[PDB]
Every structure is written in C-alpha cells, then in structure tokens.
Design a protein around this ligand. Structure first.
Ligand code: RBF
Ligand code: K
Ligand code: NA
Ligand code: NA
Length: 314
C-alpha cells in the first residue's frame, strides 16, 4: 500500500534546530522505507513566519484528504489545530514538542524541558563562575528568545534559572526577546546589550536568529549555551554546552511507525533524560577541548543524578 506524509513546518526548516531535526528524521524514515520498494510520498510545507496563516494552511492540507499523517512541531500547534480536528476528524496529526492529551486524531510528544534547560543553566553558571577566558566576576547569564510563549516562560526560563542557582543562589538570568525567529541582526543587538550589562554566558533560542548571538560571541568575547541540537561546531570554543532534544530520532521513529501501520491515532507522551530523549552532549571532542575539567566533572555528576531519579525535575 502506498503512503503519503506531509510535514507542516511552522516557519522555515533551515537554521531552526527543532524543524531541521523534524524534517531530517521524517526524511530518514521515508528514504529508508522507499528503499524496500514501497511507494512513499513526502511533502514538506514551509509556512513561513506569518502565524496568522498557519491554521488555514493546515486546514487545506487536511481538506486535501491525501495524507495518511500530517506531522508538525511546537507547543502552539495543538491550539492552532483545535477547529481542524473538529472539522476533519478522519485526518491524523502527529505533533512533536507539544502536549495535547485527550484528542482523538492528534498524537503528541513533549520533551522534559525542565531537565533540558536545567542542564543548560547549570553548565552556564559553572562557566560564568569560573576563570575561563571570557568569564567575568559577575553572576549574570542571559537568554535570548525568539518570542515569549507559555513553555518558554513556565518551563525553559525557570528551569534555566534553577540550574544556575544550583551552582550559586546569587545567579541571575536576563531574558531578552527578538520578536521573530529569523532576524540575526536583532538578536545580535540583544546580545551586545547583555554583554555590556555583564552577561558572560548566553543561551540563544531564537531560530535562524541564533546565528546573530554566535556572531556577537565572537565579536565581543562571551560564551554560548546552545539548545536543542549539537551546536559545538558552530563556534568552536565559544559554544560551551549543547543541551538537546532527540527530535531527529523521535521524528524518524514515529514516522516509521506510521508507515508500518503502528502509530496510534492519539496520545500525549512526555520523554526525558531517563527515556533517552533529552541529553547533554558530553561526547563531542569540541566540548572536551573547550571546557575545563572541574566544570565537566560537575556537569557529569549532575547528569548522573538526573539519570537515577535522585534529582527529579518533573
Ligand atoms: C509559535 C512558536 C513558533 C516557533 N517558531 C520557531 C522557529 O521558527 N524556529 C525555532 O528554532 N524555534 C521555534 N520555536 C521554538 C521551538 O518550538 C522550541 O520551543 C525551542 O526551540 C526550544 O526547544 C517556536 C515556538 C513557538 C511556540
Ligand atoms: K506564560
Ligand atoms: Na560571570
Ligand atoms: Na567568574
């Protein structure tokens, strides 16, 4: 039996870790199963930045009645989908990085981003408190978000702060917002503001604008806590951590289940460190070269406490 899949990207694929990972994993599954001789179609729709059009674009994909599954990502998608689920109940949807319990035609997976961001904040504070080249004597770290949204304000920011405060309760996090997920010039401006306020380690979570923060790091001399995927090679020596979600693998795994007829129609899963889907990347040689022993030792010890449940971050 032939199978057709659509991926709805709420923005652009390139330069957005969550969407690049999503598309890479769906493609990997499709390519794999095509190679067995099976006919599998894959269409990727890049919606672009205009969020006011997302709902109608998704409704048209459902109305086309051709996709066995429409795949998307990000925590706003369940809300976007609400009337579409009602109007087109036979259309199956899969959304990663989201949470929608108790739907009938929508299955979601959320990562434990308290773990993810706590790992990032702890690493950031260790670096900021150290005598590394660009560290200063303040206890100030930064976060530059593309936009504000409930997961960012209720999970990521508080967990980043909590991880930092586990190192020293005096740590502060200065949050800034770009207003979009692409403009690297505008994120660089925020990074310069943070640097001059005394921030020596920043975490960019602003999509294609992340590059602006990397540029500012090289320009001014500060460190970057990278999120979502492996960012060490994007600015060797500046990127001091990668605190990640295993979105490429999850997208691959769930797409395969769809193709083989094993993906449930509904459900809302949460996957974290103990499940293997949130990680701090210690194995990259750039990390080992970039970050001194005492910091790496403490970061490893933290990972062990999360892996055992001793430190549970629900
Ligand atoms: C409405 C909305 C739009 C988003 N757009 C992007 C994006 O274009 N690029 C990106 O890298 N992350 C984007 N994210 C963030 C992403 O889903 C995730 O929360 C962060 O990458 C941290 O894991 C978006 C989040 C929301 C809620
Ligand atoms: K909020
Ligand atoms: Na510091
Ligand atoms: Na210091």
């Amino acid at each position: 039996r032939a199978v057709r899949i659509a991926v709805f990207v709420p923005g652009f694929r390139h330069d957005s870790p969550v969407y690049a990972m999503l598309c890479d994993g769906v493609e990997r599954a499709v390519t794999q199963e095509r190679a067995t001789g099976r006919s599998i179609g894959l269409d990727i729709i890049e919606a672009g930045p205009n969020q006011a059009l997302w709902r109608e674009k998704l409704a048209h994909l459902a109305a086309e009645q051709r996709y066995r599954l429409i795949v998307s990502s990000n925590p706003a998608l369940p809300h976007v989908l609400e009337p579409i689920l009602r109007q087109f109940p036979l259309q199956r949807f899969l959304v990663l990085d989201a949470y929608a319990p108790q739907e009938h035609s929508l299955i979601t997976f959320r990562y434990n981003q308290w773990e993810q961001a706590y790992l990032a904040g702890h690493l950031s504070a260790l670096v900021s408190a150290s005598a590394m080249r660009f560290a200063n004597a303040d206890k100030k770290i930064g976060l530059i978000a593309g936009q504000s949204y409930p997961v960012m304000t209720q999970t990521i920011i508080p967990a980043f702060l909590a991880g930092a405060r586990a190192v020293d309760p005096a740590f502060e996090v200065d949050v800034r917002v770009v207003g979009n997920w692409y403009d690297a010039a505008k994120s660089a401006d925020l990074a310069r503001i943070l640097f001059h306020e005394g921030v020596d380690v920043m975490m960019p979570i602003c999509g294609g604008a992340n590059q602006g923060v990397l540029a500012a790091a090289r320009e001014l001399g500060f460190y970057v806590s990278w999120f979502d995927d492996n960012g060490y090679a994007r600015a060797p020596g500046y990127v001091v951590g990668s605190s990640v979600m295993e979105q490429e693998r999850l997208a691959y795994e769930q797409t395969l289940r769809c193709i083989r007829g094993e993906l449930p129609s509904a459900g809302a899963w949460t996957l974290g460190v103990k499940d293997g889907y949130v990680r701090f990347i210690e194995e990259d040689p750039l990390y080992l070269q970039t970050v001194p022993e005492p910091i790496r030792v403490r970061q490893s010890a933290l990972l062990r406490r999360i892996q055992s449940g001793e430190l549970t971050l629900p």
